[PDB]
Amino acid sequence: IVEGSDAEIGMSPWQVMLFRKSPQELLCGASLISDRWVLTAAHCLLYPPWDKNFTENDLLVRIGKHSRTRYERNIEKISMLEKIYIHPRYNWRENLDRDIALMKLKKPVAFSDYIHPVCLPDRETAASLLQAGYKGRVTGWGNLKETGQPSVLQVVNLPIVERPVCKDSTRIRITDNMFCAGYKPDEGKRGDACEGDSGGPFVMKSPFNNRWYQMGIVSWGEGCDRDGKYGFYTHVFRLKKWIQKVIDQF
């Protein structure tokens, strides 16, 4: 996260770290949506241009974390993966359209002060909140600058951007399964996701029921925190029927 701040303890209890077993390293962010299911970006698991195609046994998820590098004894919980599910129309060739994946854990994780699931939006919450100017929150342990790394989880709040501005910021084809967020050059304020944050959540706190909803998944950007560029996020609600199909059947 570029131009964010340290998270408060328990501020993002749905945060998940995707962790490679060997070499031990941070792969991506992710989020907890129930005691057995973790949501992330498809590109965190499958990206053939970079020879990336992880299997379940390659990975762990670490839940309840604050410190990036510490083993947070008596706080974090480490879970093994039973199965990975990638959206069948995830477009890794062109533009990361439908950049979404689910991971089922081998055993349910116990909730605590530090471990708690985020809500997924329904149609009405998406319609109400996914509007240009409305701010969401992005969290992660990724790089502090495009070109170092944080001691603890970082947090930044960023406004959703008008779709024509998103499209006009890039040569990549932007689809209805994506939205973009970030400050414009003239807005003064700054901030973005960066390498290591992808797969993590873009959340909004509903003013109707005071619950946090995951509206986006950190998907891609051209650099980090560049003037006139924006971060692109998977539109979770637009892919919710696939989420529900997977959970209901597996």
């Binding site: 031990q24 390293e25 590098t69 510490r70 083993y71 480490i78």
Partner: peptide, 10 residues
């Protein structure tokens, strides 16, 4: 630079 995790998870 990650602290070792318990062997039980590996």
């Amino acid at each position: 630079d990650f602290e070792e995790i318990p062997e039980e998870y590996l």
